[PDB]
Amino acid sequence: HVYNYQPCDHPRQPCDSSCPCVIAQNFCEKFCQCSSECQNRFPGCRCKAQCNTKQCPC
């Protein structure tokens, strides 16, 4: 069930299980209204050599 990303909006709600990204089984993008503390956002892709291999989580 691959779902197209949708910007979840949480003006006062937390990034709860009601989060559209959460229910969509997908990470919250930086375009989402989930704050800079949302735990569903991607962490940052710090693969030193090249972000290109099996060790690269990305």
Next chain:
DNA sequence: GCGTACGTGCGTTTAAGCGGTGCTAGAGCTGCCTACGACCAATGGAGCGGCCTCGGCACCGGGATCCCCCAGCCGCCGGCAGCGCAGCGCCTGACGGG
């Protein structure tokens, strides 16, 4: 489960052990003489107290390793399953015998 090496036993054999000398070295003691450490009275300054000021170390923050981990990756190889086959014993021909 393997296996060796250490316990048990036997058969030499030899140095411990006993009993015996014989010695003098060295310990024990005494006599006597000296010096050296305790004691006493003085003296000052080394040591101990009281301030009291810088920076060595503490602490931080950040960047720098660097081991630790492990899937990636391949080599290897052996097992394994499949395939081709080598050899044999029987099967069965070739041909004279029965």
